Write a protein that holds these residues in place. Sequence first.
Motif, short mmCIF file in Angstrom:
data_model
loop_
_atom_site.label_atom_id
_atom_site.label_comp_id
_atom_site.label_asym_id
_atom_site.label_seq_id
_atom_site.Cartn_x
_atom_site.Cartn_y
_atom_site.Cartn_z
N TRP A 73 0.70 -1.20 0.12
CA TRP A 73 -0.08 -0.10 -0.10
C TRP A 73 0.68 1.15 0.13
O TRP A 73 0.64 2.05 -0.88
CB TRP A 73 -0.89 0.14 1.15
CG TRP A 73 -1.82 -1.04 1.16
CD1 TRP A 73 -2.52 -1.71 -0.11
CD2 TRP A 73 -2.45 -1.90 2.27
NE1 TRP A 73 -3.47 -2.75 0.54
CE2 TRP A 73 -3.23 -2.77 1.84
CE3 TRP A 73 -2.05 -1.68 3.87
CZ2 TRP A 73 -3.98 -3.74 2.80
CZ3 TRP A 73 -2.85 -2.65 4.75
CH2 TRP A 73 -3.64 -3.51 4.19
N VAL A 132 5.41 3.14 -3.82
CA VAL A 132 5.09 4.04 -4.76
C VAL A 132 5.90 3.43 -6.11
O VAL A 132 7.04 3.51 -5.98
CB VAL A 132 5.19 5.34 -4.67
CG1 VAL A 132 4.86 6.17 -6.00
CG2 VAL A 132 4.43 5.86 -3.50
N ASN A 177 -0.53 10.56 -5.59
CA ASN A 177 -0.67 9.42 -5.44
C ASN A 177 0.51 8.35 -6.52
O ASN A 177 0.93 7.52 -6.06
CB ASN A 177 -2.27 8.82 -5.69
CG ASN A 177 -2.27 7.43 -5.28
OD1 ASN A 177 -2.62 6.61 -6.19
ND2 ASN A 177 -2.18 7.20 -4.05
N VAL A 197 -11.67 8.46 -0.45
CA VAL A 197 -11.92 7.56 -1.62
C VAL A 197 -10.30 7.04 -1.61
O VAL A 197 -10.18 5.69 -2.11
CB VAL A 197 -12.32 8.19 -2.87
CG1 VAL A 197 -11.21 9.51 -3.14
CG2 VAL A 197 -12.70 7.33 -3.58
N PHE A 198 -9.25 7.77 -1.38
CA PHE A 198 -8.00 7.36 -1.73
C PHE A 198 -7.55 6.37 -0.41
O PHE A 198 -7.23 5.23 -0.69
CB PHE A 198 -6.89 8.59 -1.52
CG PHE A 198 -6.56 8.80 -2.97
CD1 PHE A 198 -6.00 8.25 -3.98
CD2 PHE A 198 -7.23 10.08 -3.32
CE1 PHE A 198 -5.54 8.51 -5.32
CE2 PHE A 198 -6.96 10.64 -4.67
CZ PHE A 198 -6.35 9.96 -5.65
N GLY A 199 -8.00 6.55 0.69
CA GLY A 199 -7.65 6.06 2.06
C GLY A 199 -6.53 6.45 2.57
O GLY A 199 -6.30 6.11 3.97
N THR A 200 -5.72 7.30 2.08
CA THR A 200 -4.70 7.97 2.82
C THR A 200 -4.71 9.51 2.41
O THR A 200 -5.62 9.95 1.58
CB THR A 200 -3.42 7.30 2.83
OG1 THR A 200 -2.29 8.41 3.08
CG2 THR A 200 -3.25 7.09 1.30
N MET A 201 -3.55 10.22 2.80
CA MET A 201 -3.22 11.65 2.15
C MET A 201 -2.42 11.49 1.15
O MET A 201 -1.00 11.66 1.43
CB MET A 201 -3.14 12.76 3.26
CG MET A 201 -3.29 14.11 2.97
SD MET A 201 -4.94 13.96 2.12
CE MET A 201 -4.96 15.85 1.51
N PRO A 202 -2.45 11.28 -0.37
CA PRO A 202 -1.44 11.33 -1.18
C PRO A 202 -0.55 12.61 -1.19
O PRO A 202 0.85 12.63 -1.61
CB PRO A 202 -2.05 11.14 -2.52
CG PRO A 202 -3.46 10.46 -2.04
CD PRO A 202 -3.60 11.11 -0.67
C1 LIG Z 1 -2.44 5.77 -3.49
O1 LIG Z 1 -3.47 5.30 -3.85
C2 LIG Z 1 -4.04 3.99 -3.45
C3 LIG Z 1 -5.35 3.52 -3.97
O2 LIG Z 1 -6.48 4.76 -3.57
C4 LIG Z 1 -3.73 3.74 -2.08
O3 LIG Z 1 -3.87 2.28 -1.51
C5 LIG Z 1 -4.90 2.13 -0.63
O4 LIG Z 1 -4.12 2.39 0.67
C6 LIG Z 1 -4.90 2.07 1.55
C7 LIG Z 1 -4.15 2.70 3.03
O5 LIG Z 1 -2.92 2.96 2.63
C8 LIG Z 1 -5.35 0.76 1.95
O6 LIG Z 1 -6.51 0.82 3.16
C9 LIG Z 1 -6.21 -0.66 3.89
O7 LIG Z 1 -7.19 -1.32 3.52
C10 LIG Z 1 -7.45 -2.66 4.13
C11 LIG Z 1 -8.34 -3.40 3.68
O8 LIG Z 1 -8.37 -3.72 2.22
C12 LIG Z 1 -7.29 -2.34 5.60
O9 LIG Z 1 -7.18 -3.62 6.33
C13 LIG Z 1 -6.11 -1.53 5.90
O10 LIG Z 1 -6.26 -1.24 7.31
C14 LIG Z 1 -5.99 -0.14 5.20
O11 LIG Z 1 -7.23 0.65 5.71
C15 LIG Z 1 -6.05 0.31 0.64
O12 LIG Z 1 -6.45 -0.89 0.56
C16 LIG Z 1 -5.26 0.51 -0.65
N1 LIG Z 1 -5.71 0.23 -1.86
C17 LIG Z 1 -6.71 0.76 -2.44
C18 LIG Z 1 -7.55 0.26 -3.92
O13 LIG Z 1 -7.63 1.84 -1.78
C19 LIG Z 1 -2.34 4.06 -1.51
O14 LIG Z 1 -2.10 3.96 -0.21
C20 LIG Z 1 -1.98 5.35 -2.07
N2 LIG Z 1 -0.64 5.80 -1.65
C21 LIG Z 1 -0.50 7.13 -1.48
C22 LIG Z 1 1.13 7.37 -1.19
O15 LIG Z 1 -1.19 7.96 -1.19
#
Ligand SMILES: *[C@@H]1O[C@H](CO)[C@@H](O[C@@H]2O[C@H](CO)[C@@H](O[C@@H]3O[C@H](CO)[C@@H](O)[C@H](O)[C@@H]3O)[C@H](O)[C@H]2NC(C)=O)[C@H](O)[C@H]1NC(C)=O
Lengths: 580, 566
Positions: A344, A347, A536, A561-566
């Motif tokens: 995750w 990059v 991202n 929607v991303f899940g973090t702060m890119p």
């Molecule tokens: C760039 O964007 C991608 C996609 O949006 C990011 O990947 C996503 O990252 C998050 C956390 O960094 C992941 O969330 C995780 O989900 C699992 C369950 O699937 C959970 O158990 C964890 O605790 C966490 O919440 C997520 O799965 C992952 N993928 C997607 C498709 O969202 C990536 O982090 C971003 N990178 C940067 C540098 O912003």
Amino acid sequence: PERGDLSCRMHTCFDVYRCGFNPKNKIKVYIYALKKYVSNTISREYNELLMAISDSDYYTDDINRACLFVPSIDVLNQNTLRIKETAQAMAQLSRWDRGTNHLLFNMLPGGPPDYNTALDVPRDRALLAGGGFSTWTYRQGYDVSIPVYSPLSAEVDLPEKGPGPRQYFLLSSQVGLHPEYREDLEALQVKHGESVLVLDKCVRKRCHKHQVFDYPQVLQEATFCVVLRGARLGQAVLSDVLQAGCVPVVIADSYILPFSEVLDWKRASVVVPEEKMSDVYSILQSIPQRQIEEMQRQARWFWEAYFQSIKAIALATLQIINDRIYPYAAISYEEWNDPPAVKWGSVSNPLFLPLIPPQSQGFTAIVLTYDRVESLFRVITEVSKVPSLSKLLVVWNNQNKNPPRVPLKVVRTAENKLSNRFFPYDEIETEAVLAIDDDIIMLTSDELQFGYEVWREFPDRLVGYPGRLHLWDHEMNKWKYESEWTNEVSMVLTGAAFYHKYFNYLYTYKMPGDIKNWVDAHMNCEDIAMNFLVANVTGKAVIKVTPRVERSECINKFASVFGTMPLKVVEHRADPVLYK
Amino acid sequence: NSSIYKGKKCRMESCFDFTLCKKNGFKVYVYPQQKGEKIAESYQNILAAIEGSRFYTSDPSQACLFVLSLDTLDRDQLSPQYVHNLRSKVQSLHLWNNGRNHLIFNLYSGTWPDYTEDVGFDIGQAMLAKASISTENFRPNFDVSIPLFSKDHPRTGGERGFLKFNTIPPLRKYMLVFKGKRYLTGIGSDTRNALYHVHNGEDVVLLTTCRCDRDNTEYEKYDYREMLHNATFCLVPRGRRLGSFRFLEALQAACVPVMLSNGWELPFSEVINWNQAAVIGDERLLLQIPSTIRSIHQDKILALRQQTQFLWEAYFSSVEKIVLTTLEIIQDRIFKHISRNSLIWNKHPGGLFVLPQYSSYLGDFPYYYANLGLKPPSKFTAVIHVLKLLVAAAKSQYCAQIIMSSRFLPYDNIITDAVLSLDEDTVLSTTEVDFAFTVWQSFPERIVGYPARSHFWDNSKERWGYTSKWTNDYSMVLTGAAIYHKYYHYLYSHYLPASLKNMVDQLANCEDILMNFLVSAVTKLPPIKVTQKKQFAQRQSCMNTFASWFGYMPLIHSQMRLDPVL
Ligand SMILES: *[C@@H]1O[C@H](CO)[C@@H](O[C@@H]2O[C@H](CO)[C@@H](O[C@@H]3O[C@H](CO)[C@@H](O)[C@H](O)[C@@H]3O)[C@H](O)[C@H]2NC(C)=O)[C@H](O)[C@H]1NC(C)=O
Ligand SMILES: O=c1ccn([C@@H]2O[C@H](COP(=O)(O)OP(=O)(O)O)[C@@H](O)[C@H]2O)c(=O)[nH]1
Ligand SMILES: *[C@@H]1O[C@H](CO)[C@@H](O)[C@H](O)[C@H]1NC(C)=O
């Protein structure tokens, strides 16, 4: 058969005509029906293997459309096999001309007294997924090195505590094997007998001189684990030592580690020659703590993904063979070797080549507008005087109103939305794209040229003038939006920005969730989605060039929607060398 | 005992004495060049590259590897470069020792019949750095595969990659272009010969030459360079030998090679992942080959293009790089805990610039902070080569420790991965140090510093010159008031030859210039200048010597400074 042609390779023995160019790029693994072969009873592990292969998408019930083959003869451990009349069964298999494509799963090869390393049963041509592989008896690129599955993986489930300090540094947990090994182990334990722990017996338990140790829990307590080989190169202690988060120390010379073709065992295990017992401890003293914990994580994820059930073994083996047979559509190294926790955060910048384009191609200037005729005319007049303006086209977003030294191409936009500014138009003959807006009559062509110059140094970054910042409100538990003069920058609005043409393809072909349609259904917040996407995908920051629907809601929506702060926070702007 | 496992079955555990290879590290001994012996220009280049490397050792006693001084490269009897009575002339040598710890380079082994593996002379227990080696005859972890280059291939340096204008979509004017020959009536060329089924007079122009009149008429229409630059994929098929010159030519023009040489170990396949940089295809699926390259996604094509350029400029642009890569591969075979990961070789900057003796952990290098999801270190060690400057450096939140080439040694007293270099009279305030460190955290690979200078081409004398005048751009940041990773110190101590460091010590200058040359060679990026600030013949000679040793100019001009916002 002929004992197994050790010169067989994927180009001289493997048959690829029957395995063509299926659009999904997935192989077919047909399984032979079970037969009595009056053969030993099929073990539970082989039943798990068959079920795992059948349930996956690799399976195919059509014999004439099968890429790989797999028999029903359990040859996981031939120590309980006759090593005879099983070759008769293998040759009896239908479509076994010489075993060109058949795949054999073995866990413990050899037997008394020589203990060979690859399935002493006559094989001739045969895809050999086997453990205990030796460098000489290992057809590199053809055979697959698979582990020996230990029942402790399924019978015993232990806490998955993270890497960190452990009680004993070096540990040997194997009861017996060629006394001299025990002799050098005890020589090691004589001098520094605090860290090194040598233990024995007194299937599920082990012992010390007097203390009794539960197995495989004792592994979890010692950070380093001395794996030997004894009778066979491949030992089922490897699973056990992986599940506990113990870095393997292999001391089997000429031993092909399991899944070494696609996995990076150099960052997960330590290989020590059998002639360095006296100072292997010093070897382990060389490795620092950070690499120790990285190797512990790599070992733990290797267990979780490949050394946990026969299903994982089968999937990994079939995926390796698929990668070999389809190199163009093969899974990348990161997918093979990265646990999801780091997968995750890691990059992979699509534009990773550190090129610098020449000063001859120029940029592109996509102008979008609906009704700003006077401001649009002023903008086009001012932009038309920069030497690098390779071309300047117009995007007329309005439908009611109609259009009244470089190609001033106009294209009447069919529908009205912001995303029209980010389509990969074929009219863009350059890589640099200048997104400019009508309210930016405040920019002179000098600064546009300087922005193109700065973009030339970073052809994969976001180089723009309007600086914007995001912050975090813990009291509101949400992100905010700052446009006031601040000491940090995280965004550049697309009202005046040089960006790689690839980002248009990114925006209007690959966006997380429904961000594009959501933001064009709304009327604003498009100059934040592009910055989010860039930060991202590239994992890099922004270059602000010179001092120049609530938006916080869309910032928070993008973050969710991303899940973090890119977006990355920086305190540096690009200026000219001969500035004032 | 390993008597049975010798010959074709030779491995490092049976045909390589590890006692000779001591902690000193992979010393290579070249034999003296006996007078009146045939020696090709290419082998002269290879031997000179070995001499100019850090692995060279004049003493055979103090060696752990041996390379012959005889022209073993061309082992074709019909070739004018062939050396006669080679087996007698190597068996006469007493240091041969049945080829134990011996490396034997070769390019054109074999003759007209079948061009087999036969090298002529007995090699015994010697490693082969053979080109166009087949997997059947390959000895994994023992033999190395190398690129087949020409006599005009640069000895040092190499031409930069032709790929400019990284356009989207990455596909160029034509898709599949092939121009070559069809060896008639013999072994080899059974693919090139059948490169007409796929031909369509379109983006799949497989124009061959010697029915032959039509082929010749259609062959003399385009230009080979014009079709190599206006292309997406370029075939690299099999002829008489498994390898050809087209591999490096397509790897330089970025034309994504589509391998059609069944059973060829790609150069340095032990450490290089070629699924990242090329399409490997079976020659038995040639009819399917076009559809497959049609089905490759645009992002995959972009990654393949950039990786092709990276690999070219990293391991293939010069003969010296090829030889050094072979040496590094064989060296990593020795200590399995002091080798390089599969990630070190396969991405920027490369295995030649990354030394595992410094560290085998990717987190100890500044090149992988994004691939590991990690962050650059928050602490820097200050090195000074004064009281007010020391106080200013100490008044910072990132200064963990405070401490001619003596300032670039691999000191074990340094704990952090970032080093700030200071001189006697460098007026560097605490805010300046903090901003420089933050910028370095943004750009860890590069050098971030306040003093900058440039280089100019003296066309009146046809040389390089050093300009300290305030110009419109810069290409070099002096390593005297700059922040950079400490790994470069080790690289300075263990990659540059003894000659350059010796002259830099003797003339007591040109250390920052040499460091900038090295870092620009590594990163291939201009240095980063921060803030406005900006408070002889020896330097020009240093520039010319560095350009000669590198074989090119690694310095890159930059017009943009970096300033604090507001
Ligand atoms: C760039 O964007 C991608 C996609 O949006 C990011 O990947 C996503 O990252 C998050 C956390 O960094 C992941 O969330 C995780 O989900 C699992 C369950 O699937 C959970 O158990 C964890 O605790 C966490 O919440 C997520 O799965 C992952 N993928 C997607 C498709 O969202 C990536 O982090 C971003 N990178 C940067 C540098 O912003
Ligand atoms: O139109 C052509 C044909 C060949 N070559 C050169 O010929 C070599 C490879 O072509 P050829 O088929 O003659 O050699 P082979 O690949 O069979 O060794 C390379 O150096 C190419 O640059 C070239 O430059 N233009
Ligand atoms: C590509 O083709 C054009 C003609 O269409 C020619 O002028 C050019 O030299 C070729 N090569 C390139 C652009 O590298």
